Amino acid sequence: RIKVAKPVVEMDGDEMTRIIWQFIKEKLILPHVDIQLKYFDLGLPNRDQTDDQVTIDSALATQKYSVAVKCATITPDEARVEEFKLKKMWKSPNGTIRNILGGTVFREPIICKNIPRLVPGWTKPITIGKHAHGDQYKATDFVADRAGTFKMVFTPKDGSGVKEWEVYNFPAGGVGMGMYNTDESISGFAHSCFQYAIQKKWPLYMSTKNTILKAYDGRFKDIFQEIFDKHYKTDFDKNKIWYEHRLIDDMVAQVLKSSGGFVWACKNYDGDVQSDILAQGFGSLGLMTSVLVCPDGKTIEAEAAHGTVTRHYREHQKGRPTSTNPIASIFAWTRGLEHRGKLDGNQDLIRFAQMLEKVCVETVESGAMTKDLAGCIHGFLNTTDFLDTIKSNLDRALG
Amino acid sequence: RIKVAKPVVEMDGDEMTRIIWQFIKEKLILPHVDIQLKYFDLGLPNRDQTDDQVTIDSALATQKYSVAVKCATITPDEARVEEFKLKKMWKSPNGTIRNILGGTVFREPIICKNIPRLVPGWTKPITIGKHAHGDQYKATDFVADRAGTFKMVFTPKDGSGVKEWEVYNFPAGGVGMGMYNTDESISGFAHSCFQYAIQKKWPLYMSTKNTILKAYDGRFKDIFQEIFDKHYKTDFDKNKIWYEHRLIDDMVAQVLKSSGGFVWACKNYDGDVQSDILAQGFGSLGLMTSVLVCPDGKTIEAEAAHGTVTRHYREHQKGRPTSTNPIASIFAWTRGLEHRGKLDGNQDLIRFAQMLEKVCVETVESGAMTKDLAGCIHGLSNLNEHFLNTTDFLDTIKSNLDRALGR
Ligand SMILES: NC(=O)C1=CN([C@@H]2O[C@H](COP(=O)(O)OP(=O)(O)OC[C@H]3O[C@@H](n4cnc5c(N)ncnc54)[C@H](OP(=O)(O)O)[C@@H]3O)[C@@H](O)[C@H]2O)C=CC1
Numbered sequence: 001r002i003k004v005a006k007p008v009v010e011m012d013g014d015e016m017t018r019i020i021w022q023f024i025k026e027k028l029i030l031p032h033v034d035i036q037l038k039y040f041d042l043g044l045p046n047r048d049q050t051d052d053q054v055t056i057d058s059a060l061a062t063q064k065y066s067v068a069v070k071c072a073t074i075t076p077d078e079a080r081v082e083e084f085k086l087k088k089m090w091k092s093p094n095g096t097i098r099n100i101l102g103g104t105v106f107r108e109p110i111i112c113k114n115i116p117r118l119v120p121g122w123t124k125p126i127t128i129g130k131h132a133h134g135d136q137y138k139a140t141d142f143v144a145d146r147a148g149t150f151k152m153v154f155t156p157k158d159g160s161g162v163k164e165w166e167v168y169n170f171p172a173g174g175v176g177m178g179m180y181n182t183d184e185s186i187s188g189f190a191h192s193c194f195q196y197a198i199q200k201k202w203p204l205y206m207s208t209k210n211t212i213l214k215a216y217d218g219r220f221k222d223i224f225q226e227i228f229d230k231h232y233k234t235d236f237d238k239n240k241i242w243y244e245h246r247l248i249d250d251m252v253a254q255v256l257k258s259s260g261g262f263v264w265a266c267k268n269y270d271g272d273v274q275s276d277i278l279a280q281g282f283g284s285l286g287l288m289t290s291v292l293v294c295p296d297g298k299t300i301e302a303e304a305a306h307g308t309v310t311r312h313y314r315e316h317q318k319g320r321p322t323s324t325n326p327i328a329s330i331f332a333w334t335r336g337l338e339h340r341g342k343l344d345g346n347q348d349l350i351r352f353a354q355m356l357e358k359v360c361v362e363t364v365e366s367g368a369m370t371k372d373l374a375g376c377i378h379g380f381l382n383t384t385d386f387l388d389t390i391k392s393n394l395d396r397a398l399g
Numbered sequence: 400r401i402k403v404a405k406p407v408v409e410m411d412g413d414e415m416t417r418i419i420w421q422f423i424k425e426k427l428i429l430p431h432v433d434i435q436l437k438y439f440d441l442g443l444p445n446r447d448q449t450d451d452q453v454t455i456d457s458a459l460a461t462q463k464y465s466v467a468v469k470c471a472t473i474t475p476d477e478a479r480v481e482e483f484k485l486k487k488m489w490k491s492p493n494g495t496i497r498n499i500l501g502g503t504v505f506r507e508p509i510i511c512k513n514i515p516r517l518v519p520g521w522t523k524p525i526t527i528g529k530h531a532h533g534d535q536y537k538a539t540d541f542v543a544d545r546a547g548t549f550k551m552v553f554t555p556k557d558g559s560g561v562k563e564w565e566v567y568n569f570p571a572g573g574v575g576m577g578m579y580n581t582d583e584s585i586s587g588f589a590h591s592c593f594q595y596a597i598q599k600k601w602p603l604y605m606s607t608k609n610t611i612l613k614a615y616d617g618r619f620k621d622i623f624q625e626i627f628d629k630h631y632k633t634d635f636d637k638n639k640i641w642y643e644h645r646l647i648d649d650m651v652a653q654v655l656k657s658s659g660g661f662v663w664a665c666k667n668y669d670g671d672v673q674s675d676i677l678a679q680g681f682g683s684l685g686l687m688t689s690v691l692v693c694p695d696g697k698t699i700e701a702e703a704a705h706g707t708v709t710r711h712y713r714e715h716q717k718g719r720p721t722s723t724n725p726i727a728s729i730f731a732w733t734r735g736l737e738h739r740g741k742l743d744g745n746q747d748l749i750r751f752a753q754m755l756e757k758v759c760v761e762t763v764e765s766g767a768m769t770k771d772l773a774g775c776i777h778g779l780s781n782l783n784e785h786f787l788n789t790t791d792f793l794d795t796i797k798s799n800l801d802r803a804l805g806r
């Protein structure tokens with residue numbers, strides 16, 4: 001049992017992933033790792049009870065202890081309010097955490113040699129660098145229930161000329177929203193993508209729709225171009241790599257037609273959508289890592305890219321067995337452990353974390369998998385039996 | 400030559416598509432069809448000169464004559480202002496036309512039997528119903544060059560409680576934007592998708608990110624669900640089909656692992672992105688139709704889903720040969736002519752439009768194709784011997800159409 005000097009922030013979640021998480025912690029991590037966990041229940045009942053304070057606390061603890069492992073959580077809508085008897089529609093915990101921590105979320109597939117791809121052309125993996133700040137996740141939206149003028153107004157701190165924009169004169173009912181991003185957050189996002197692309201010796205592509213959002217998306221295009229020209233142009237030339245900005249509509253088709261082997265800088269929203277296309281295309285949502293790398297180059301939050309997988313939980317609620325892939329949730333733990341071991345200089349912790357990752361891949365390659373992966377092969381084991389095979393193979397590998 | 404009583408609005412465009420468009424009109428349409436064409440040059444130099452009035456005018460003309468055929472156009476940014484030396488960064492002509500006309504843009508692949516898919520699982524076609532109004536296309540965005548507060552003001556016209564929301568307090572430089580949609584536009588978009596799904600006898604899926612944009616995306620989900628329960632539940636139930644709302648992140652993955660055969664209602668932005676994933680996955684951006692179906696159920700605007708193909712035009716400008724797929728552009732004319740034929744009752748125009756569509760598919764199926772398609776068969780890196788260049792391919796279309804008209 002490996003002794004761990006510093007703690008790891010643990011963010012418990014919801015539904016099917018909460019079930020998988022409990023097994024990982026109690027049967028895969030804690031039996032072989034003497035680790036202190038700063039436990040934060042990000043389960044929807046606890047978030048409602050604490051009036052979403054538990055979310056902010058888990059993020060501040062992450063900034064403090066440098067490492068977080070997050071279970072998928074429910075982002076409530078009108079239907080969840082009825083289902084859980086909530087006080088209100090709480091903001092996305094992911095949105096709250098990412099806005100507090102900041103940075104770039106790096107997402108990439110967990111490759112298994114035996115799993116056929118839905119996109120055979122993708123011979124090499126692709127990494128998405130998703131901007132973790134602002135945009136839709138920090139937007140203010142409303143229902144306009146009558147006629148009225150929708151205006152935007154920017155009042156500078158320096159008391160210069162007040163700017164005013166008439167967005168829309170509503171003739172009747174509708175919807176409106178406002179959102180923002182900062183030069184400093186875009187800069188940190190840009191630096192992280194150029195640094196990762198150099199490290200991988202891979203070209204970097206950044207996508208926007210600047211032809212439409214000329215000022216909003218144009219700033220992303222401008223900031224990335226400026227930073228490349230000043231700090232990374234020479235390094236990119238030395239490593240025989242390149243940087244290119246493409247329109248999102250073009251980029252997505254370019255990706256699908258490609259053979260992989262590149263870094264893709266995505267805006268916040270595109271990052272979510274496109275990483276799920278990548279994860280599915282390579283094999284499954286259960287086969288993708290997701291790591292938030294903060295601008296300080298020390299703090300991380302590892303998670304799965306998928307959700308609480310509600311549809312599989314509904315079957316469980318009926319007493320029926322399920323076939324939910326836990327590998328991504330396992331990799332949230334291992335990636336959080338690898339980083340803990342890297343900071344502490346604990347070679348034993350890194351070695352265990354690398355070994356649990358390897359057992360996951362080996363188990364799939366040995367023909368033991370969940371329905372999502374069996375479907376890739378022919379068009380399988382239940383959740384608990386696949387997890388038991390992981391536990392068996394990890395104990396067998398520990399000797 | 401087929402006589403046509405009523406006119407069709409023709410919106411000319413830019414770069415590679417403008418060259419292709421000239422051949423289509425002069426060598427494929429006009430030699431066989433006596434039609435009045437309400438011409439509008441939406442070519443970037445002309446838009447600048449007329450201060451973008453030509454765009455507004457073309458859209459008003461489409462409302463009058465019920466049919467428009469549009470060539471892909473450049474939406475200018477800073478780099479285009481430098482290149483063309485423009486008066487300003489003019490708004491998207493598509494955004495402008497789409498917001499005046501309104502409706503849903505229906506996008507689907509043009510299927511060729513011998514073209515291998517990049518997504519082999521897609522054994523049946525998929526139609527995207529793209530909301531053509533509001534959102535990022537009617538957005539107001541800005542660069543905040545200094546610290547300051549960004550707030551939204553909603554002033555009700557009835558004189559009731561004026562509302563305020565502070566979006567952000569900028570500590571330094573940044574970006575801000577505001578956007579909207581209407582209940583009327585969402586309702587019309589909903590009705591169009593449900594009706595098309597019944598017509599196809601296909602289930603309908605609508606995607607949003609309502610968990611994040613609880614009010615904005617929530618309105619789409621609510622309006623679609625309201626309209627389904629009230630007007631289409633029985634019609635869907637009798638036709639063995641269903642309607643389902645999905646989160647966009649789940650939807651895109653569900654689509655990629657599907658075998659096709661459904662209608663996908665997309666919000667404005669997603670509609671563009673996902674249409675290009677669909678087009679590429681089925682074979683090419685050159686093999687997809689795009690038709691704007693207005694709320695009046697009479698007015699349409701047919702186009703290609705792709706852009707002006709700037710990269711291919713940059714090679715053309717160097718004097719080098721290009722291999723650009725004109726089929727999507729040909730289908731924009733055929734769909735416009737097909738609809739003109741339908742409204743007027745002109746069966747000979749309908750049959751010509753259908754014949755020219757048949758020629759396109761048969762030409763590719765005969766092994767005569769552009770680089771994009773040949774690359775599906777032989778690989779984009781290992782190719783010159785397996786594809787025809789642009790004009791050469793177009794000459795093959797011309798020859799095969801002549802041969803088809805012969806019999
Ligand atoms: N970072 C986070 O915490 C995220 C949370 N969410 C939340 O999750 C909830 C459910 O959202 P939903 O849209 O269903 O998204 P999910 O990603 O939870 O599930 C969507 C579908 O993807 C497949 N899938 C996802 N994960 C796995 C897995 N581990 N193994 C096998 N298959 C998987 C399943 O497909 P099939 O049904 O075909 O088997 C599943 O029904 C919502 O409340 C949402 O707010 C959503 C995204 C991210």
Ligand SMILES: NC(=O)C1=CN([C@@H]2O[C@H](COP(=O)(O)OP(=O)(O)OC[C@H]3O[C@@H](n4cnc5c(N)ncnc54)[C@H](OP(=O)(O)O)[C@@H]3O)[C@@H](O)[C@H]2O)C=CC1
Nearest residue numbers: 247250471472473474684685705706707708710723724771
């Ligand atoms: N509705 C409209 O009018 C639209 C206009 N635009 C405008 O088009 C311009 C260029 O935009 P861009 O981002 O390059 O998008 P395009 O769709 O014009 O081109 C992107 C790439 O897709 C492939 N492609 C697209 N169409 C064809 C075709 N007909 N035949 C063969 N290959 C094709 C080519 O790939 P490869 O390079 O690999 O051969 C091409 O370089 C911009 O000015 C933009 O504003 C963009 C979208 C829509």
